[PDB]
Amino acid sequence: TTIVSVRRNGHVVIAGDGQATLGNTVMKGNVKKVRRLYNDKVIAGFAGGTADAFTLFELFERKLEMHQGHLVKAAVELAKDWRTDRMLRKLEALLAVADETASLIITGNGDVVQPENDLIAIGSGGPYAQAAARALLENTELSAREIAEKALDIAGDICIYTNHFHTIEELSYK
Amino acid sequence: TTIVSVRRNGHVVIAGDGQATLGNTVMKGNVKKVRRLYNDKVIAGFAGGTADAFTLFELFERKLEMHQGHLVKAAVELAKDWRTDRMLRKLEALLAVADETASLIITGNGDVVQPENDLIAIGSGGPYAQAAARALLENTELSAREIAEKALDIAGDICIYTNHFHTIEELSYK
Amino acid sequence: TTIVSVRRNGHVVIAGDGQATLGNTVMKGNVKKVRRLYNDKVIAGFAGGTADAFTLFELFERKLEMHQGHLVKAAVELAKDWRTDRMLRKLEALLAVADETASLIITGNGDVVQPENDLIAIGSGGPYAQAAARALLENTELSAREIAEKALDIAGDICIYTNHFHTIEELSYK
Amino acid sequence: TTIVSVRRNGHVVIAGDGQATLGNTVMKGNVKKVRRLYNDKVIAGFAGGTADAFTLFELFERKLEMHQGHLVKAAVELAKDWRTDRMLRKLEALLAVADETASLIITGNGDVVQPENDLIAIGSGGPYAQAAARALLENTELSAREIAEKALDIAGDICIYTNHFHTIEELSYK
Amino acid sequence: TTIVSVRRNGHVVIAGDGQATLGNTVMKGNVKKVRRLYNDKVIAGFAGGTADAFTLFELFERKLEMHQGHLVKAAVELAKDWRTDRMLRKLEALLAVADETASLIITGNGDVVQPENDLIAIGSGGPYAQAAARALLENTELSAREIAEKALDIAGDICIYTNHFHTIEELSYK
Amino acid sequence: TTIVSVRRNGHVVIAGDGQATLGNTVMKGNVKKVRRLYNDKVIAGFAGGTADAFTLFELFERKLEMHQGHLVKAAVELAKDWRTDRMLRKLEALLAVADETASLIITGNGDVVQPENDLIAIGSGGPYAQAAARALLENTELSAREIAEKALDIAGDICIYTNHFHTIEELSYK
Amino acid sequence: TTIVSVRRNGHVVIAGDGQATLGNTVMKGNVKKVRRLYNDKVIAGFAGGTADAFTLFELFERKLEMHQGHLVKAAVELAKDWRTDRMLRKLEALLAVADETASLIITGNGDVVQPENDLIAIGSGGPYAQAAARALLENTELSAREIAEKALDIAGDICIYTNHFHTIEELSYK
Amino acid sequence: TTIVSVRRNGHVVIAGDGQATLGNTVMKGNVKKVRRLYNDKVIAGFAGGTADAFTLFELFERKLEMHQGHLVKAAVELAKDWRTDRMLRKLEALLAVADETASLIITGNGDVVQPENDLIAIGSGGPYAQAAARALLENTELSAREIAEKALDIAGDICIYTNHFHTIEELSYK
Amino acid sequence: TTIVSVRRNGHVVIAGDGQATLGNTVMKGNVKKVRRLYNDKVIAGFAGGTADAFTLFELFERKLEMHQGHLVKAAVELAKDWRTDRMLRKLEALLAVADETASLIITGNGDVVQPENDLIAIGSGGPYAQAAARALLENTELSAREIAEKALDIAGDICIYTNHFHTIEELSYK
Amino acid sequence: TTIVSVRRNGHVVIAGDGQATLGNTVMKGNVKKVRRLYNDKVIAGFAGGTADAFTLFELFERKLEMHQGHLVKAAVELAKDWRTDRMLRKLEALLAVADETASLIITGNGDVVQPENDLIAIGSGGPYAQAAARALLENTELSAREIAEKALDIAGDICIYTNHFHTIEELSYK
Amino acid sequence: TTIVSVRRNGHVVIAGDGQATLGNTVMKGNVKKVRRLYNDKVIAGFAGGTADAFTLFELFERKLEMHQGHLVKAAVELAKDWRTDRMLRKLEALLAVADETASLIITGNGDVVQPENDLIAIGSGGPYAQAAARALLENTELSAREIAEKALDIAGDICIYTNHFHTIEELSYK
């Protein structure tokens, strides 16, 4: 699995592969690891079980309602309940979410992280995508969609757990 | 890795993928796992280190010279020296070879095997290819090349260690 | 265990083996892993404990009555209660169900999935059946019953946990 | 794998299945686990790698030549060299051999064993065959071939690593 | 441990050994692994801790009272509570039970199973008894008590964890 | 396996069981673990592979020839070559031997041991036999044969790897 | 550790970091993982113990002398001896080497590999460098030295086992 | 991660690195592991999840308000609730805090500790920083800011989990 | 164990602790881990078995004789024979040696290393000593003897395997 | 860690070291592992986490209040709750406590133990202190304080996890 | 096992227990772990297999002959061959030896050690004996025989693997 997020020129995107591996075999190649949330004001992705993310994303929208859509404060309340609750602690996934404000990662250890330049790359292929996206972001004028697309394809050629099926959700705020 | 061999209507083929995995990373995608031997009278493939096969294939040609190209007897002398020699015992690979006579597998345990109907499928994706090749060979009139081609593509979609780069060497005897 | 579902030409079927393994021994070879539900409007299968499926199937009929037989919405409510309830969370099985509308998989992680082309293949032999059913569905005009039948036989030859005892429930809607 | 030996009414037989398992997959179903040795005066079988047995059986014939075909003394010299030699110690297999004199087992630990009533049952399904063969030998007048045949089929129904492909080598001495 | 159940000519029996092993030593040789239940209308046996079975058997009689002695439906409610309850999930045992209606196995995974011909063989020696009982049942007219007795003695000679102390509870319904 | 040696009133004996275990299965119950050596002047037993002892006992007779039947000095030369030779080092067994002079144990570590009161008890059941033989030797006037017999039967009831088949070789010197 | 090789516009380079980690500690930061060979006609790098590479590189020069500097044939003879010799088999390292002809990887499994486009990236940070170098090579006109330099710095920011100390050996052939 | 605190000449400081590691990769290099609390009268740092510290820090300010800013008594009440609460027990972090009164460590085991000389060094690189800060504090007149600065840089050169991004909060009381 | 080497102002020193640990026990506290070599022109230390170093140091003096006292070239010939010889390969130790020319480390992997600034710190406490010696060498004018002394004492307070018994051999060249 | 208790001539003492080890490093050398309880009528020590003991000691004083200071009966109620409560069961420590009545040990297994002569020695170095304290107690007239002091210093020289920092609490009752 | 060596007032002794444990069982209680060597000029003991020591002690006498009885130089040549030879490397034991010159330990790692004050204590009970012998040697005028005797008895009371059977070899030189 690989998921990438890039932010440039008033645009931010999240892209991810569709591969679902079981042991050494491919279970499903068209998985939708990216979706929109909170009245399509937020984009998010996940690396892990599909139901585990749908549970976390739904609660994340409830934390946004309590905090009026504030991304960072809702992300900490989600990470707080995630490590806390005995039921949520069992969940195993790597969340990625972003809005016009900023991009950040969420984890089951309770750690909330905003990468340098708001460049997120997670999953088994994440480090590979981060090395490609860091190269284009500094040496090209390409739009964030073009970077996340080409970076994800490079990670699929490298990572055996990632494929070239793609799903993207751009957000323009300019 | 996946390699397939099919024999039908006076034709026999060997096909294999080009993927070379290192851990969870793709090292090389265009590997040539198939080649010809003994004045292009024999086709063969291998699953494992490239050099380990080049050593075994060279000696296999010499065993053919001593036995005047007899495939079965040369394969046993290769399997005999393979398990015996302290040098060759360190080699780890799965050989596949065929001629107009018959198809058979060779292993580092010394085991020489001719599959039912001379249908070989080896590598990490081998069982997946055997399941598809078995379905077409009984339910279709397709030529051995068409079966090995479609079977290898299905194994690449399933096996994470197999890709869709292909190399084939057909042998027509009619 | 292996279970297959195919949909073609107004017909959809579910087929599964009868093998029940205990460690390295065969406990029972004639297990009925397929049955009908909801006034015989729905066919379903299961890989796992017999009682765990009978509990999930009965509740699944309940969810269908609340949703007037809607397959997708009832499957979500079942996956919702499955992950949620402390009693149901202990259950371990892989459900497969289909109607004239569509085919989909249900899991104990809460994940509801509809495969490409509505081709389901689950159990320890599932990937082997998917490889064979994928080959026939694209390369032959065979009916969905003939594909699930031949595919399950190939999976039994390959998988050691699968046998050739078969149970099928076709549904014709045309 | 399962192999059985029965001796009755001047007749002795060795029967074994053809299944070759790789992990949870069936690699080959028609394996010949039984053969004849020393001018067809001796029958033998093996559970393990095919070449490991071909090496041990060849040397066993040489031990018979030095001891003029004496089964027991040659079996001890084989078991002596087997545990002794650094090359032979790496071999892993379970040998079964018999002649008109007596039946006995040979192992890689150096242990030579002649079962009660000269009833051998080895392999992963061996104990299952021994329980069936013990039942018929005491409660029926069936010939040793009929017992080994029916016993091996019962072991294939129970053991997942054993199948119903059969190979037999009877020896009549009366 | 070994337990056997046979059904023939209007008779059904359950037999089991008395051996209780602790590591490599025999703790007790006269254990009663068989008993009667529900007004002596039901016979049952268990492989595992003695108290774990006495707990399961008592609840099984309560499930029979709720279901008016129906064997199958009460067995599923027992298997349902067994996997469900946090206290019952800790229990580790293999139940065997039968009445004039049918014989079936119960497990801690929630799996309810009725073997072919209602022939049950469980415990460490179970597969050995199943191979002997299958031989006599097809090749002899022996009564179910005679088969379970001789089959259990064969399993005790083979299994090191089984002994020849025996306890039986026959049920005649004709 | 269990082997016992007792010396009393001018008499010394060696007794051992016949059980040969393979995993959790009984391979052979009538094994002869006791025999005579050096013109019936010496009695000996072994716990381990049959052939491994026949090799060590043969060489032990040769060490007796060089030392004119001296038990202790020949036992050290055997223990010396046992740990030294690369061939003999692979042997795994526990030897027990005695004559009119004294009783002692020999091991593959090279250790030669004479127990207190020349009471030997080896094998998986050895400690159990030593506990019973120690009780009778101090609290009864029973002859060494009666002690080794009753002690070995008690070890067979306790040890699962030991059975009640017995083989004895007494030596009277008075 | 990270090492990169790039070939463009008649130029080829090999670059690597200087970090040497011991557990969670940095042992040395200025390690020279790159050097020249065969009269400065060949450049090479290594990931692993420093002396393990100095031994392999010395023998690699000798293989070049026997083959008159042929890179591919000498690399196979090195990989052949590497897996073969009992002394060389103990060595653990990942070699990278290139000349004006082509670039290729060598491994202790005997596997010789030439990556797509002759782009090598090995070490714990190798996949990260490959994702960055793949991005620049397709989207920029930068020289091979500029790509390997920027790619190695990105891998040092990501990999914890890689640092920004650099050593490079360019080869111009035009 | 590494965090250091030094107190000298009426001044006390807390310094920490910005590295955030995920497995063997760097997630974020500019993490702010140091901040001020209680109307900027208190400085504190944390090693662990960002949100877990923000929760503990907020509660720590609460305990300070109940105890009128007393550092020691508030730290005990925080350590008391930390071990006690089922929610807070799940939190995993290492807190460091100091004021003009004294410096002390807090842990999830409930242990409150004041180091010798009020020298705190925590995180994976903590012992390395303590070794360097101990050397300068005794052998130099450097101010506490200069010691924590140079000590944290040395820990980043050694620890692979620590980097040279720095955040400091000095407190002057004189 | 800890050993330190420092070079300053025409002076170079080697210091090491005397602790010898066996498991969790102190075997000897006054071990001399430092000594002089080659007519007192060279100082050296070792971390490991006492005899293993005495063998390597003796041969190192012979390599100096062949190379006329050249430190670097003799160290490579020692590292060459160390990994090569089957006898020397079994030795396990970490050597440290220095003369007026330069300081360097030698290892059993064959790796010869000269640290930055010729600062050596090895043993279980080596990294702790390097952290303290690095702090004083840059922030103080202290002589190399004073640095190695204070650094080794700090490593003994931290490392549990290091104590405060000291042995030093200075070399003045100015 | 090491803790010692000695009782002589109307005096009883408890002494313990200050070392706190983390892996192979010393975390803190001045730990106070000894303290007084119940109006300074009781002395106690602990080996383990500091907070775990402060929890157990506080509850132990409450058990003394319910039992009017009776040492033994309060120790059993503490050991009873310790094994019982799900929260206290997680605690890991070795308690030592004494009064004018008697000395005894308490454990997390629920075991209450009073050593011979009321001589307690616990911790990783406990057995070493017990061997020294047993020597002086029988062969010298030294007071209990002198024995616990010299015994603890001997354990610190031997145990690597124990140091020479000491804390003592004597109780005189005469 | 426990072995002690003490040197005082022109006398030196070596004492050891007779216990030989197999798992949780006592194999032999009267083992002689102490003996004399080199014309009764040297005393020695061993912890480990009896024959492993007899081989090492024999070669140790040969090293003494080559070095004219020099204890230290012969001990290094023994430790050199011990780690070196492929045969001797397999031996596992802890040697203790002393003469009028000095006492020292020898190990299979090649480490030669002379304890402080020439006080050796090895075996599983060694540290317990060292703590008792250290107490008496400083606080009493007792002779070395009295110290080793009382120290070994205390170690047998503490260590479960040590008993009170004793063997001593004193050497007087005055």
Swiss-Prot record, chains A, B, C, D, E, F, G, H, I, J, K:
It catalyses: ATP-dependent cleavage of peptide bonds with broad specificity. PROSITE patterns: PROTEASOME_BETA_2. Its main location: cytoplasm. It is found in: Cytoplasm. Keywords: Allosteric enzyme, Cytoplasm, Hydrolase, Metal-binding, Protease, Sodium, Stress response, Threonine protease. One of its GO terms (biological process) is proteolysis involved in protein catabolic process. It is an enzyme of class 3 (hydrolase). Allosterically activated by HslU binding. The active site is at T1. Induction: By heat shock. GO terms for molecular function: metal ion binding; threonine-type endopeptidase activity. Its EC number is 3.4.25.2. Na(+) binds at G156, C159, T162. It comes from the Bacteria. InterPro entries: ATP-dep_Prtase_HsIV_su, Ntn_hydrolases_N, Proteasome_sua/b, Proteasome_suB-type. GO terms for cellular component: HslUV protease complex; proteasome core complex. NCBIfam families: ATP_dep_HslV, PRK05456.1. Belongs to the peptidase T1B family. HslV subfamily. This is ATP-dependent protease subunit HslV. The gene is hslV.
